[PDB]
């Protein structure tokens, strides 16, 4: 930064600019940063609370905080989100610009029950972004602490901490320890400000479209194929006795199912089906026991949300995959709630290309039939990738994560975040912030020991983030109208996506991007 | 290089997710009778296993486990019989070493 | 405007002003909830506004005198459009613009 105490270090700019094929969404917020761990790096482990072999962990908690803006509703208003999803077949991020400014560091003293807060003008904060991706990257794990959806809210910066390898609650030899004061970081007083600019690597557009066709129906309904299939292994029964014969027909309008096809549905990893009407569910706890989960190094980790698959079948609304959806809270919901409080997203738009998450991929022959032996088949619950598969990624939601970091590995298959958004090798850097320690008066005779005695203080200020988004226009020749995301129209006690009488902003429903349709 | 983290642990241990998962399909038993209910929690420091994740472990093609202490192995010859092997044109070819997977 | 004055398609813009929130000390362990706890504060200052007005002169050939807006002339306990003993400014009457006359 440049000037001194009585000069503001940056303006409030929160806006959205729709120009041509791009949109630039700027958002500004006010934040508050406490002092974490009394300026201490501490190791954390599951030893303190026994938990279970699956939940064991080992790691470190740091005094540093961090800035999270990895949810769309940070950058989008409900109206701006509506322009996007109604008018466009896809979008991707292009550029990023981050700013801290108008920094204030308060000192707080407690005497005789009365708490006093005063400006400390000479105290600093430390801020650095990790550009080289050297620290553990905890973004993209869909935690709390992101900038709020509503510009008028004030949010508290979350604490930074990370996990590493472990054996039980202990640490193995490969466990890493990172000191974050071992990086260069800019130190800022009230006149100083912080900024950096970032540029997204090239990624495919998100698909904001739903298919208007299905794989199995891509044919011409009027015309008959020139390819035979095997219709019958017996002669047409007259009610007397079946006689062995091989009969071949041509796929045609009459029978589409038997007709030949070039393509196959996407892969599935199956999951249990749960009903929203309680009396239709089994009486037992199958949530963890009957769960679909993957086994890694003796740990069973639930598969959530998992491979993208349609949530329910054509006519069945009430069923949902046990682990196979994203679930959001309604406003004023605790960390433990019932079905009425949650907001539950479903992918019904991927039914054309994708299996239903709660049902089989297909069925496959298990044996070699003969004259005495009868044909047997087995059900395919899980299927990996086969040549000729097509699928869709999970949808992105106004409340959902924007990106996640692709791990650094020898290989990956079609990397995309299974929660949603844009897989990135070099995602937006983590921004880390801390209150610099201010010692309380030292003893006046030299002792080597650690101080532990500090002035309790916190800092506040504003942060603005600006992302440039690229749009993919809708080319469709469809005659009839599209589906659109609309407002309620009929009267109601309060406006959706607006504050109530008490001042509490709320988002009544999740909103996905897939409305406009295109051919498959 | 060896990784210093695991896929399942990539999260932030200090902070709680905004995503619910389905914790229980019955009401918390008092020792009387279970009652049907759906209960959703948030993945957090307490339960990492149930917490939502972006990624999955690599593919596997499974294989039999043999112990270096002879008395812990079964008494039989399972080396070829209990082997993991692929079938190509009527030939059974042992899968060696196979898809990369942690040994133990 | 049926109350009076100048109808404007693009009137003078609304100027909007607010005190930026200053949070009170946060709890030191992370909670997502809205703060609601702020430092009570207010701001003061000066504002100046300058308008340029255009005038239309009186061309009349009328022989006799016009009506004019005049002061009281006779003595009274206090001056009109001036403060009283207690310091309270007051406007004793409304004053319109229509005095000078012209032909119809």
| Three-class secondary structure assignment of A406-450 | CCCCCCCCCCCCCCCCEEECCCCCEEEEEECCCECCCCCCCCCCC
Burial class (CB in 10 A: 0-12, 13-18, 19+), A95: middle
- Cis bond before residue A57 (omega within 30° of 0): no
The CA distance from B80 to the nearest CA of chain A, in Å, is: 22
Of A127, A97, A104, which is closest to residue A27 (Cα–Cα)? A97
Contacts 24+ apart (CB under 8 A), C31-38: C31/A156, C32/A144, C32/A145, C32/A156, C32/B16, C32/B18, C34/A153, C34/A154, C34/A504, C35/A32, C35/A154, C35/A156, C38/A154
Asked whether the beta carbons of residue A138 and residue B4 sit closer than 8 angstroms, the reply is no
Distance of CA A143 to the CA centre of its chain: 9
Quickly tell me which residue has 């593919």 as its tokens. Answer: B59
Could you give the CA distance from residue A243 to residue A189 in angstroms, rounded to a whole number?
93
- Three-state DSSP state, A275: strand
Could you give the CA distance from residue A437 to residue A214 in angstroms, rounded to a whole number?
61
Name the DSSP class of A24: E
- Three-state DSSP state, A16: strand
The per-residue DSSP string of C45-68 comes to: -------------------SPPP-
Could you give the CA distance from residue A396 to residue A193 in angstroms, rounded to a whole number?
33
Residue A75 host element (H or E): helix A72-75
Of A10, A195, A192, A2, which is closest to residue A105 (Cα–Cα)? A192
Of A266, A284, A271, which is closest to residue A311 (Cα–Cα)? A271
Non-local (6+) Cβ contacts of A372 within 8 A are: none
Whether A511 and A205 have beta carbons less than 8 Å apart is answered as: no
Of A397, A353, A400, A344, which is closest to residue A513 (Cα–Cα)? A397
Distance of CA A8 to the CA centre of its chain: 36
- Three-state DSSP state, A362: strand
User: For residue A130, what are the CA distances in angstroms to A127, A183, C10?
Assistant: 10, 9, 48
Non-local (6+) Cβ contacts of A177 within 8 A are: A60, A164
Would you tell me which residues 95-124 of chain A have a C-beta closer than 8 angstroms to some C-beta of chain C? 102, 104, 106, 108, 115, 117
Could you give the CA distance from residue A208 to residue A91 in angstroms, rounded to a whole number?
8
| Structural gaps in chain C: residues followed by a C–N separation over 2.5 Å | none
Joined together, the tokens standing for residue A306 give 């998992």
Nearest to C22 among A34, A145, A460 (CB): A460
Of A322, A289, A328, which is closest to residue A306 (Cα–Cα)? A322
Could you give the CA distance from residue A12 to residue A27 in angstroms, rounded to a whole number?
9
Non-local (6+) Cβ contacts of A2 within 8 A are: A9, A191
Could you give the CA distance from residue C66 to residue B99 in angstroms, rounded to a whole number?
108
Could you give the CA distance from residue C4 to residue C2 in angstroms, rounded to a whole number?
5
User: For residue C36, what are the CA distances in angstroms to A152, A392, B84, C40?
Assistant: 12, 43, 63, 11
Whether A424 and A412 have beta carbons less than 8 Å apart is answered as: no
Whether A87 and A166 have beta carbons less than 8 Å apart is answered as: no
- Three-state DSSP state, C80: coil
Of A358, A357, A331, A354, which is closest to residue A514 (Cα–Cα)? A354
Contacts of C34 in chain A (CB under 8 A): 153-154, 504
Could you give the CA distance from residue A203 to residue C75 in angstroms, rounded to a whole number?
87
Quickly tell me which residue has 């495919």 as its tokens. Answer: A204
Name the DSSP class of A38: G
Quick count: other Cβ atoms within 10 Å of Cβ A367?
A: 11
A336-338 and B36-42 as β-strands: parallel, antiparallel, unpaired?
antiparallel
Quick count: other Cβ atoms within 10 Å of Cβ A232?
A: 13
Joined together, the tokens standing for residue A309 give 């698959």
Could you give the CA distance from residue A336 to residue B38 in angstroms, rounded to a whole number?
11
Question: What Rg, from alpha-carbon coordinates, does chain C have?
Answer: 26
Question: Is some CB atom of chain C closer than 8 A to the CB atom of B12?
Answer: no
3-state percent breakdown (helix, strand, coil) of chain C, nearest 5: 0, 0, 100
Could you give the CA distance from residue B89 to residue A250 in angstroms, rounded to a whole number?
31
- Three-state DSSP state, A83: helix
Question: Is some CB atom of chain B closer than 8 A to the CB atom of C31?
Answer: no
Joined together, the tokens standing for residue B6 give 């695991």
Whether A120 and A438 have beta carbons less than 8 Å apart is answered as: yes
Non-local (6+) Cβ contacts of A243 within 8 A are: A234, A235
Q: A43 φ, ψ to 5°?
A: -85, 145
Could you give the CA distance from residue A254 to residue A104 in angstroms, rounded to a whole number?
75
Contacts 24+ apart (CB under 8 A), A171-176: A171/A58, A174/B2, A174/B3, A174/B4, A175/A58, A175/B4, A176/A136, A176/B4
Q: A68 φ, ψ to 5°?
A: -115, 120
A22-33 and A154-156 as β-strands: parallel, antiparallel, unpaired?
parallel
Joined together, the tokens standing for residue A390 give 């097509």
Non-local (6+) Cβ contacts of A74 within 8 A are: A27, A146, A147, A148, A149, A465
Of A58, A45, A303, which is closest to residue B6 (Cα–Cα)? A58
Quick count: other Cβ atoms within 10 Å of Cβ A172?
A: 12
Non-local (6+) Cβ contacts of A87 within 8 A are: A471, A473, A474
Residue A102 host element (H or E): strand A88-111
Residue A82 host element (H or E): helix A78-87
Alpha-helical runs (H) found in C1-104: none
Asked whether the beta carbons of residue C23 and residue A36 sit closer than 8 angstroms, the reply is no
Question: Is some CB atom of chain C closer than 8 A to the CB atom of B15?
Answer: yes
User: For residue A227, what are the CA distances in angstroms to A216, A232, A269?
Assistant: 16, 16, 32
Contacts of A57 in chain B (CB under 8 A): 9, 13, 48
Joined together, the tokens standing for residue A463 give 């942060």
Of A68, A96, A63, A74, which is closest to residue A185 (Cα–Cα)? A63
Q: A125 φ, ψ to 5°?
A: -120, 160
Could you give the CA distance from residue A408 to residue A425 in angstroms, rounded to a whole number?
8
Polymer length of chain B: 104
Whether C21 and A154 have beta carbons less than 8 Å apart is answered as: yes
Question: Is some CB atom of chain B closer than 8 A to the CB atom of C73?
Answer: no
Could you give the CA distance from residue A409 to residue A418 in angstroms, rounded to a whole number?
17
- Three-state DSSP state, A80: helix
Question: What Rg, from alpha-carbon coordinates, does chain A have?
Answer: 29
Question: Is some CB atom of chain B closer than 8 A to the CB atom of A286?
Answer: yes
Question: What Rg, from alpha-carbon coordinates, does chain B have?
Answer: 22
Whether A218 and A231 have beta carbons less than 8 Å apart is answered as: no
Q: Give the up-direction half-sphere exposure of residue B51: CA atoms within 13 A in the CB hemisphere.
A: 25
Whether A158 and A514 have beta carbons less than 8 Å apart is answered as: no
| Three-class secondary structure assignment of chain B | CCCCCCCCCCCCCCCCECCEEEEEEECCCCCCCCCEEEEEEECCCCCCCCCCCCCCCCCCCCCCCCCCCHHHCCCCCCCCCCCCEEEECCEEEECCCCCCCCCC
Nearest residue of C to residue B18, measured between CA atoms: C32
The per-residue DSSP string of A147-208 comes to: PPSSTT-EEEPPEEEEE---BTTB--TT-----GGGS--EEE-TT--EEEEEEPPP-PPP--
Quick count: other Cβ atoms within 10 Å of Cβ A305?
A: 27
- Three-state DSSP state, A477: coil
Non-local (6+) Cβ contacts of C88 within 8 A are: none
Q: Residue B22 forms beta bridges with which residues?
A: B40
Nearest residue of A to residue C40, measured between CA atoms: A117
Of A145, A115, A197, A150, which is closest to residue A28 (Cα–Cα)? A150
Whether C65 and C30 have beta carbons less than 8 Å apart is answered as: no
Of A180, A224, A193, A211, which is closest to residue A40 (Cα–Cα)? A180
Of A249, A192, A200, which is closest to residue A225 (Cα–Cα)? A249
Could you give the CA distance from residue A166 to residue A42 in angstroms, rounded to a whole number?
16
Most A CBs within 10 A among B24, B26, B55, hence the mutation to make, goes to: B55
Joined together, the tokens standing for residue A507 give 């988002």
Could you give the CA distance from residue A461 to residue A106 in angstroms, rounded to a whole number?
11
Maximum CA extent, chain A: 112
Burial C71-83, CB ≥16 within 10 A → b, else e: eeeeeeeeeeeee
Could you give the CA distance from residue A152 to residue A158 in angstroms, rounded to a whole number?
19
Burial A22-31, CB ≥16 within 10 A → b, else e: ebbbbbbbbb
Q: What angle do CA A509, A278, A272 make, to 5 degrees?
A: 80
Q: What stretches of A366-402 adopt beta strand conformation (E)?
A: 377-380, 382-383
A377-380 and A362-365 as β-strands: parallel, antiparallel, unpaired?
antiparallel
The per-residue DSSP string of A312-349 comes to: S-SS--SEEESSSS-EEEPTT--SEEETTTEEE----T
Asked whether the beta carbons of residue B26 and residue A297 sit closer than 8 angstroms, the reply is no
- Three-state DSSP state, A84: helix
Name the DSSP class of A278: G
Whether A56 and A44 have beta carbons less than 8 Å apart is answered as: no
Could you give the CA distance from residue B27 to residue B45 in angstroms, rounded to a whole number?
23
Joined together, the tokens standing for residue A4 give 């001194």
Q: A86 φ, ψ to 5°?
A: -80, -30
Could you give the CA distance from residue A155 to residue A31 in angstroms, rounded to a whole number?
5
- Cis bond before residue A345 (omega within 30° of 0): no
Quick count: other Cβ atoms within 10 Å of Cβ A99?
A: 21
A159-163 and A58-67 as β-strands: parallel, antiparallel, unpaired?
antiparallel
Joined together, the tokens standing for residue A9 give 């270090």
Contacts of B51 in chain A (CB under 8 A): 141, 302, 304
Could you give the CA distance from residue A74 to residue A67 in angstroms, rounded to a whole number?
12
Nearest residue of B to residue A49, measured between CA atoms: B46
Could you give the CA distance from residue B97 to residue B101 in angstroms, rounded to a whole number?
10
Of A122, A53, A84, which is closest to residue A457 (Cα–Cα)? A122
Could you give the CA distance from residue A346 to residue B71 in angstroms, rounded to a whole number?
53
């Amino acid at each position: 930064g440049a000037d001194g105490v009585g000069n503001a270090s940056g303006n409030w700019h929160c806006d959205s600019t729709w120009l041509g094929d791009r949109v630039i969404t700027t958002s500004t917020r006010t934040w508050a940063l406490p002092t974490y761990n009394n300026h201490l790096y501490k190791q954390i482990s599951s030893e303190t609370a026994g938990s279970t072999n699956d939940n064991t962990y080992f790691g470190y908690s740091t005094p540093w905080g961090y800035f999270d803006f990895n949810r769309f509703h940070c950058h989008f208003s409900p109206r701006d989100w509506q322009r996007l999803i109604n008018n466009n077949w896809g979008f991707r991020p292009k550029k990023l610009r981050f700013k801290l400014f108008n920094i204030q560091v308060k000192e707080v003293t407690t005497n005789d029950g009365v708490t006093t807060i005063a400006n400390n003008l000479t105290s600093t904060i430390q801020v650095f972004s990790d550009s080289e991706y050297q620290l553990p990257y905890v973004l993209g794990s869909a935690h709390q602490g992101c900038l709020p959806p509503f510009p008028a809210d004030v949010f508290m910066i979350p604490q930074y901490g990370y996990l590493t390898l472990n054996n039980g609650s202990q640490s193995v030899g490969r466990s890493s320890f990172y000191c974050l004061e071992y990086f260069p970081s800019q130190m800022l007083r009230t006149g100083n400000n912080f900024e950096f600019s970032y540029s997204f690597e090239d990624v495919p557009f998100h698909s904001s479209y739903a298919h208007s066709q299905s794989l199995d129906r891509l044919m011409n309904p009027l015309i008959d194929q020139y390819l035979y299939y095997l219709a019958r292994t017996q002669s047409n029964p007259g009610g007397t006795a079946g006689n062995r014969e091989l009969q071949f027909y041509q796929g045609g309008p009459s029978t589409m199912a038997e007709q030949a096809k070039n393509w196959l549905p996407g892969p599935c990893f199956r999951q249990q089906r749960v009903s929203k009407t309680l009396d239709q569910n089994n009486n037992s706890n199958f949530a963890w026991t009957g769960a679909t989960k993957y086994h890694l190094n003796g740990r069973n980790s639930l598969v959530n949300p998992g491979v993208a698959m349609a949530t329910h079948k054509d006519d069945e609304d009430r069923f949902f995959p046990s682990s196979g959806v994203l679930i959001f809270g309604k406003t004023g919901a605790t960390n433990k709630t019932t079905l009425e409080n949650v907001l539950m997203t479903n992918e019904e738009e991927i039914r054309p290309t994708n299996p239903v998450a709660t049902e089989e991929y297909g069925i496959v022959s298990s044996n070699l039939q003969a004259a005495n032996t009868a044909a047997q088949t087995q059900v395919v619950n899980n299927q990996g990738a086969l040549p000729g598969m097509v699928w869709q990624n999970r949808d992105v939601y106004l409340q959902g994560p924007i990106w996640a970091k692709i791990p650094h590995t020898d290989g990956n298959f079609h990397p995309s975040p299974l929660m949603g958004g844009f897989g990135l090798k070099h995602p937006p850097p983590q921004i880390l912030i801390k209150n610099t320690p201010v010692p309380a008066n030292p003893p006046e005779v030299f002792t080597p020991a650690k101080f532990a005695s500090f002035i309790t203080q916190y800092s506040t200020g504003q942060v603005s983030v600006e992302i440039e988004w690229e749009l993919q226009k809708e080319n469709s020749k469809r005659w009839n109208p599209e589906i659109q995301y609309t407002s309620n129209f009929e009267k109601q006690t309060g406006v959706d996506f607006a504050v109530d009488s008490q001042g509490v902003y709320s988002e009544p429903r999740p909103i996905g991007t897939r409305y406009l349709t295109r051919n498959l």
